[PDB]
Design a binder for this molecule. Structure first.
Ligand SMILES: O=C(O)c1ccc(O)c(Cl)c1
Ligand SMILES: O=C(O)c1ccc(O)c(Cl)c1
Lengths: 263, 265
């Protein structure tokens, strides 16, 4: 992959692997989400990083608060997918990363994504909010005019997600992270939560529908010693409301929505 | 990737990804095992397959892994390019063998090697059967004629007999369940998932002070989506060696047995 001519975005091509595809011989949403993280990490490396010099000094990190993915066409096993990604300042509230997924052969948009990231202290886990010093540092790597993957005035990526009420229609209890679910820093990586949400979707919807939209809120991180319950209720195309909480006390870790289209 | 000049082996290069590396900033053994199956599947596609021969598809027969043996001298770091060469070999009526050689693309040095035993089984009845002549003639044209072993040595680890772990186990990991991400396109539990399940019962202190050098795994029975697995480990030893057992949480039906060798960092 490489930075585009202007140096304000990054593009990478990915050949879809045999083990990255699901039952319908196309890339899973867990595979797409890994590719979005991979192209994001590579964009950061190519511009000198995801923390800045004064972020390392204050022990500050960027953490995902929201992830929103919309897939029109999943790439098949063997196909080449092109992903373009860019960052954008969103005032002192945080930062945004956006993605555009394309078929490398036809040049057609097959998917798009957006994510909200906020600043927190690595040690106390407290939201410190963006400062002017840590704004000019990476503003030089972002387009100045707004560049939104989801431009539309009041789109799905900015919708308020409510809290699922008990009893849930569907559930998947006792979900636990394994060593393969952790990153190089030993934290549960964000893709694991997406798979945990989708575990409570009934197999009949998985077999007759394809996932088109997924919005996820990140409230709290799951530790290696924590256990997760995945809850789902139909609210309708088929639409679901999702909740991830700790098996024990019921502490919320995530909430979300999924939209599914008939095959 | 592509077939080599003689058409008897296949090579592919892989750039190591950010999410494919562990705490050590190097590719996990679960990542290496995925890359070995990826290069194996691509070798099969380049020689006219979609694993099964024309005769195997007629009889509802498939190839299934009976044993996997991996030896890693140096794990590739995040961003490095790894070259993998793979080839198949007939073993008479017993089955086939798939071997791998892993190299650093920059230095050209061998950083790992692997071997695997595969037997023929009826897809429907799950009954093992010896390789017939019509099947053996169809794939021998894609395999080297002279023996080409990834592990040539006269007393190599890939052919060692693995015993059954006795209760009580020293270490354990209870309630392991496969998720939808752990299944392949045919809805079967992915072979790599068993490797991760074995390594779940390794204590965190060995993971932090040692690196995995060798892993031999036997496949006795496949785990279903509705099955629950218990992972058991006992130390049997400068190097640390373990005996592994995977069994169904309920009745205690064996699914796998193995050994791991770990060297100090
Ligand atoms: O194989 C599939 O279609 C598949 C894979 C993963 C997962 O999250 C779901 Cl809901 C389906
Ligand atoms: O991150 C690691 O070190 C790691 C990852 C997977 C795995 O199974 C083991 Cl034992 C260790």
């Amino acid at each position: 992959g490489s930075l585009t001519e202007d140096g304000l975005s990054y593009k990478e091509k990915f050949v879809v692997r045999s083990y990255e595809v699901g039952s319908n011989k196309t890339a899973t949403v867990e595979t797409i989400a890994n590719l979005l993280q991979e192209v994001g990490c590579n964009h950061a490396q190519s511009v000198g990083f995801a923390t800045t010099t004064t972020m390392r000094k204050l022990h500050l990190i960027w953490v995902t608060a929201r992830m929103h993915i919309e897939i029109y066409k999943y790439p098949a096993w063997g196909d080449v997918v092109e992903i373009e990604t860019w960052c954008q300042s969103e005032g002192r509230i945080g930062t945004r990363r956006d993605w555009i997924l394309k078929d490398s052969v036809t040049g057609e948009v097959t998917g798009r994504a957006t994510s909200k990231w906020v600043m927190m202290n690595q040690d106390t886990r407290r939201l410190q909010k963006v400062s002017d010093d840590v704004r000019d540092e990476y503003l030089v790597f972002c387009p100045q005019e707004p560049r939104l993957a989801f431009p539309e005035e009041n789109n799905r990526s900015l919708k308020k997600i409510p809290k699922l009420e008990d009893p849930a229609q569907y559930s998947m209890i006792g979900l636990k992270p394994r060593r393969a679910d952790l990153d190089m820093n030993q934290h549960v990586n964000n893709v694991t939560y997406i798979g945990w949400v989708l575990e409570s979707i009934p197999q009949e919807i998985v077999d007759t529908h394809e996932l088109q939209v997924i919005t996820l809120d990140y409230r709290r991180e799951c530790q290696q010693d924590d256990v997760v319950d995945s809850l789902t209720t139909t609210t309708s195309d088929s639409q679901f409301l999702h909740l991830l909480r700790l098996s024990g006390d019921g502490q919320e870790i995530n909430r979300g929505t999924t939209l599914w289209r008939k095959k």
